[PDB]
């Protein structure tokens, strides 16, 4: 059918924006991520989302942030948007301190863990590495 | 009615499982800047999977890596749109 927008709020947009990482990780800075975060914020704010940006979050901070969002009341929200900007590997997302499984973040909003959002779209946008393969491309017409 | 607890998620990934994901110096990641430009252009017109298809196209066609790092030059990227949505998703009540 289509997801109903007949709610007071289209919903929340949570942006997790990680530029600088724990030197013990050896991960290089992600310069220009503030460009990404600001562009996302502007875009989603123009469609009526209430945008909150959380900068340079550790794994445990991320978890508390999203657990809080999960446990909130979204009965007036039509949808939830979450944008994840960080380093990554196959199946994991780097906090500033170390990696966490992506499934652990996104399962916080699963239908039985977040009843305020059952039947409404949970939209994740994930800018992170997922491994170390490189795509050489292929020429076409 | 009962629905699956995993339903109504969308995971729009910047890149294919197992692959690197690319950024420009300081003009944003390829994926996020294409996402923002298609959201800007079509967010009031297309539904979400139509938009992300045009994001996949823009990332796949308009970007190619330039690097002096050995083995990282002239590389390509395609994003990875994982849908467990059960309905069309539009961001406006009436698409124009």
């Amino acid at each position: 059918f289509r997801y109903s927008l007949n709610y007071p709020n289209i919903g929340h947009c949570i942006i997790i924006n990680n530029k600088n990482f724990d030197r013990r990780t050896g991960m290089n800075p992600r310069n220009g991520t503030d460009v990404d975060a600001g562009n996302v914020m502007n875009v989603f704010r123009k469609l009526g989302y209430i945008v909150k940006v959380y900068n340079d979050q550790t794994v445990a901070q991320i978890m508390q942030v999203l657990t809080t969002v999960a446990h909130d009341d979204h009965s007036r929200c039509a949808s939830l948007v979450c944008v994840l900007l960080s380093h990554g590997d196959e199946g994991v997302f780097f906090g500033t301190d170390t990696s966490v499984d992506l499934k652990s973040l996104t399962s916080l909003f699963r239908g039985d863990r977040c009843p305020s959002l059952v039947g409404k779209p949970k939209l994740f946008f994930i800018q992170a590495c997922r491994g170390t393969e490189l795509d050489p491309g292929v020429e076409t017409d | 009615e009962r629905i699956p607890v995993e339903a109504d998620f969308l995971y729009a990934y910047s890149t294919v499982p197992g692959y690197y994901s690319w950024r420009t110096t300081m003009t944003g990641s390829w994926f996020i800047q294409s996402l923002c430009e298609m959201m800007t252009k079509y967010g009031s017109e297309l539904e979400l999977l139509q938009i992300m298809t045009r994001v996949n196209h823009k990332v796949a066609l308009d970007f190619e890596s330039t690097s002096n790092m050995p083995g990282f030059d002239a590389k390509k990227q395609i994003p990875c749109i994982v849908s467990m949505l059960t309905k069309e998703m539009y961001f406006t009540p009436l698409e124009h």
């Binding site: 960080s86 992170a128 590495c129 | -």
Partner: peptide, 4 residues
């Protein structure tokens, strides 16, 4: 261009 650089990587994440």
């Amino acid at each position: 261009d650089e990587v994440d």
